[PDB]
Amino acid sequence: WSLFGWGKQKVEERNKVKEELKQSELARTAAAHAKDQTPTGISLKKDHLVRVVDPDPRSRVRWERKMVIRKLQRGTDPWSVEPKAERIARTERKLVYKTGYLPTSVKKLVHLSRQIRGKTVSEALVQMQFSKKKMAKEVKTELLRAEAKAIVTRGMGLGKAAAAAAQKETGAEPVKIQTKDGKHLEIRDPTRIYVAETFVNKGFTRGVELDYRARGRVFKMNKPTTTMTVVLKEEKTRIREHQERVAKKLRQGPWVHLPDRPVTSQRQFYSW
């Protein structure tokens, strides 16, 4: 039902689509049947999603055969170890969010992405509310959307109440880490969301202005639009990355006074 075909048809045709939608709502209507639909009306039945969630079952099936054979070639090997990338994906939550097309440039918005980098979402929103830049109001709206996606879609930031207990009910000693830049933090809630990564890209050309100079000269001025990507992670990623840097510093060994430096010239005689 297009927006320019809805008025090009007679009432009988239009009034025949409403009885279709009407009769579709009588079949959708306590708890076991009411949990198969989202508040937006998306029916969570397999037959209703198989055509969109599983459009190509002939290719998915073969791909799932490739991963099961690759998973048994590792369970047979006695020396296999879970890759670092496979072990983090199933332990640490992450959300990549790409903002909408902002009416600004990359050399302007790049400085607004380096300001919120590394900060927590709460710390980053307080800096967008009190910035003088016109694009800081757009970064505050796009950072609230990403946080909503993280909490709902990915489940992040949902452990506070549980973490507040150990700190106070048991007087536990929170974790003290140090970021890659060197800033010291004290994490009491490991589920707190923060801005791990962020980069700005350039989009399509908003428009074109003409610059009428002297001597009948004209120049084209491209109006830029740009986007920003935020990678939101929980504080468990920073507590893991700090323990790795600390372990790599205690693994290089201590400093010895007289080191055994190599002599890198080989000669077919003795010089001493």
């Binding site: 508040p39 037959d47 209703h48 079952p57 332990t91 939550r93 879609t153």
Partner: protein, 198 residues
């Protein structure tokens, strides 16, 4: 999107996202797991060499040998080997509607024809092209005389006769190779009435 959604369910495991609670895709404006009305009703016009291909197995676009009211069997897609009765017959795109509860699919309703309390997504009956369905008709076993259902793979018109004064015609459909004249399904004529302005 399905190539990337399956790699995440494999990797994330217990951290698999809840994509059904996500926002729409601004490229097309659809929700998760829902089609678009243009793609769920198959109302997009097709070329003339396509209509002849979709109807190749049942006559031709102007001598179609399938009518509404006759049971068909699906032979393509996820809902293969399904059997339902034809309700509508769109002769423009050569698409057919089967009012079976298994062919339903989520669709995103455009907000210009929807109230503000109405749910954005609804389940409507999806249509199929004519090529994706074959005719099912019960025939008699010549050896034992028992009636059983069979799938008709091809139909062709027979005994075509036109009426020039009325611009009408009446033909018969038969199964090539076996010459089994299949009767037409019970079609109710449109109700013609006398209006006050006539």
């Amino acid at each position: 999107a399905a190539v990337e959604a399956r790699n995440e369910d494999w990797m994330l495991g217990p951290l698999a996202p809840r994509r059904e609670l996500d926002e729409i895709t601004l490229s097309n404006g659809n929700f998760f797991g829902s089609l678009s009305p243009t793609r769920a009703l198959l109302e997009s016009e097709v070329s003339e060499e396509e209509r002849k291909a979709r109807v190749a197995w049942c006559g031709s676009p102007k001598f179609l040998c399938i009518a509404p009211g006759d049971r068909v069997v699906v032979i393509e897609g996820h809902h293969k080997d399904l059997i339902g009765t034809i309700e509508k017959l769109n002769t423009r795109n050569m698409t057919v509607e089967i009012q079976s509860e298994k062919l339903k699919t989520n669709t995103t309703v455009p907000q210009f024809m929807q109230n503000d309390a109405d749910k954005p997504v609804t389940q409507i009956y999806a249509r199929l092209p004519i090529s994706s369905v074959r005719l099912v008709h019960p025939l008699k076993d010549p050896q034992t005389g028992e009636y059983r259902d069979v799938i008709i793979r091809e139909l062709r018109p027979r005994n075509i006769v036109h009426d020039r004064p009325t611009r009408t015609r009446s033909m018969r459909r038969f199964v090539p190779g076996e010459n089994i004249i299949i009767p037409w399904p019970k079609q109710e004529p449109i109700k013609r009435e006398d209006q006050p302005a006539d």
